[PDB]
Design a protein around this ligand. Structure first.
Ligand SMILES: Nc1ncnc2c1ncn2[C@@H]1O[C@H](COP(=O)(O)OP(=O)(O)NP(=O)(O)O)[C@@H](O)[C@H]1O
Ligand SMILES: [Mg+2]
Length: 343
């Protein structure tokens, strides 16, 4: 029955009072009074059974959201669908209702250092859990970081996530890539498929920089301009870093470029806590092997008000999914994954 700016958003007896929020990927997002728990909640409608590619992204996100339990990762409290495969056109994911996300927040609000430190702690704490499950998010950016009115931060959108696979990370120069351009590590344009953990840390660094001045630090307009932005600020890679790149074409591209030096961080962010800049530096290290890991970051001095490893939990066990089978099998699997929420 109930409609909300057509669409049909029928989420049954339990959830009423629908109010629009935005436009997700391949569906719509509403808030809605939950008549069993007596709170407002959020509800994403997802209609992906036509295009095979949205079905992997829905299956992935569904598997992960139900396996993970963590205060800084968005949950699935409920998942609503028809009682049969045949009748299932859409899928609805009910979550906690978060006021805003960091993208929307950074357009209008400048943040205090106390807030930056706190949000960074929460991102890194949630990322620790994710990596501990051997998973990579692959698409961390401000719009994937949800916030409520009490400053609680929750990572969302695991559509692009993958199980880590460091042994199969090498690829050729200029290999096309899916994740959001601005938060892409440099090795992705050189020689990485994005199957190692240090891909997520680069993105977190990109977010710290953005939180620090309200503006993306590497806003490249297209695939290769992303790299020139990165190099504009870090300057030319050292020879040792270039020697970790064995890939000939990527290495010669880098050698062909004129020498540029490092723009120092405090020239770029003169107001910032210099401990914040120090960690920034370590997150946005050119060489992925030297870039800081998630635990080292949590233990950096910038975060010592919050750091407490025993209150920074890890997953019960590794993750293992799948990828490439067709529309129809993926529909069966999404049906199967969501059975538990039926009566
Ligand atoms: N739990 C939530 N509470 C409030 N708003 C949410 C919540 N989850 C997602 N959002 C939405 O996040 C949107 C931002 O745009 P978008 O980049 O499409 O993210 P998304 O809706 O999460 N789907 P995706 O594109 O898969 O990340 C906003 O329009 C909100 O509607
Ligand atoms: Mg998005």
């Amino acid at each position: 029955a109930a409609a909300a700016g057509p669409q049909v958003f029928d989420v049954g007896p339990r959830y009423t009072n629908l109010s629009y929020i935005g436009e997700g990927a391949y569906g719509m997002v509403c808030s809605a009074y939950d008549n069993l728990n007596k709170v407002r909640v959020a509800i994403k409608k997802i209609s992906p059974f036509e295009h095979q590619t949205y079905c992997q992204r829905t299956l992935r996100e569904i598997k992960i959201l139900l396996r993970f339990r963590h205060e800084n990762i968005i949950g699935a409290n409920d998942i609503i669908r028809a009682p049969t495969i045949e009748q299932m056109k859409d899928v609805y994911i009910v979550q906690d209702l978060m006021e805003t996300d960091l993208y929307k927040l950074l357009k209008t609000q400048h943040l205090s250092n106390d807030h930056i430190c706190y949000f960074l702690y929460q991102i890194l704490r949630g990322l620790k859990y994710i990596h501990s499950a051997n998973v990579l998010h692959r698409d961390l950016k401000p719009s994937n970081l949800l916030l409520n009115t009490t400053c609680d931060l929750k990572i969302c959108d695991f559509g692009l996530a993958r199980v880590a696979d460091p042994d199969h990370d090498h690829t050729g120069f200029l290999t096309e890539y899916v994740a959001t351009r601005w938060y892409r590590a440099p090795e992705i344009m050189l020689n990485s498929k994005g199957y190692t953990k240090s891909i997520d840390i680069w993105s977190v660094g990109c977010i710290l920089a953005e939180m620090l001045s309200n503006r993306p630090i590497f806003p490249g307009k297209h695939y290769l301009d992303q790299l020139n932005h990165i190099l504009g600020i870090l300057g030319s890679p050292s020879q040792e870093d270039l020697n970790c790149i064995i890939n000939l074409k990527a290495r010669n591209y880098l050698l062909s470029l004129p020498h540029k030096n490092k723009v120092p961080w405090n020239r770029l962010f003169p107001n910032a806590d210099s401990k914040a800049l120090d960690l920034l530096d370590k997150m946005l290290t050119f060489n992925p092997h030297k870039r800081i890991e998630v635990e080292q970051a949590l233990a950096h001095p910038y975060l010592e008000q919050y750091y407490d490893p025993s209150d920074e939990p890890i997953a019960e066990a590794p993750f293992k999914f799948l990828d490439d089978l067709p529309k129809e099998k993926l529909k069966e699997l999404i049906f199967e994954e969501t059975a538990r929420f039926q009566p």
